[PDB]
Amino acid sequence: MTEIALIGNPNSGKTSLFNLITGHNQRVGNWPGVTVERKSGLVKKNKDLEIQDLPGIYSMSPYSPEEKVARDYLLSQRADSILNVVDATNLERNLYLTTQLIETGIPVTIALNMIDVLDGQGKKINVDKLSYHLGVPVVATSSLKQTGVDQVVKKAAHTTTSTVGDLAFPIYDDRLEAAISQILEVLGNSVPQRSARFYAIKLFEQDSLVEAELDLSQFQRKEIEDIIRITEEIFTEDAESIVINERYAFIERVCQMAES
């Protein structure tokens, strides 16, 4: 009755964590007409929770079936919650996907995974600080030591589209935030309220799939074009690089607050 999308970078420990949560309740097939494996399963300790395992990705670009699948699932609102598996030892790179996942509008809970490995390296991540700055709940997890796994699944199960009333998105440079606002005003009700920021940001980036699979009017197209052009002049960069740099700056800022 509650659906949780499990997703993260490759080699973040998604499968290990998935197998510990779901155990001998797994169903393994594939996505329609494509060789990407599709795993699903019910939570051992609560059969009313279903985990939808998604493919491991580094971002939500449109140039591969793995990412196109992850994107299409999250935008459809089939999941009530995102359980984002983050490799704690490679935190800065991992959070690039997280910023995009938070923007989908489905609530994110973070499984800060492989925490035992971080203990063996001498680094320390302040979990409360990390949680306050990303604006999402965070639980430390180890698939090896089997710690914090029931805690993070429980938190995911109670942090859903039904329970979270007011979502806090990552704030970027105010000049980029103006553009996103202007893109939202023009889009109107052409996009769902929940995932609106995702679409606005992706149209700014000039993403092929969103542009090519959205029935906008011609005036809406021309308005967004000017928002993009004008913004590029303010920054003296192309639209794609503006967003990339602003994500990495926000991530850099966050890690410096939480890292040792």
Ligand SMILES: Nc1nc2c(ncn2[C@@H]2O[C@H](COP(=O)(O)OP(=O)(O)O)[C@@H](O)[C@H]2O)c(=O)[nH]1
């Ligand atoms: N030390 C430690 N290693 C882990 C943990 N979880 C996974 N691994 C290791 O990390 C690698 C990736 O695991 P896997 O679940 O396949 O990651 P995925 O690519 O995200 O599915 C494997 O070689 C595991 O042995 C953990 O909690 N602690």
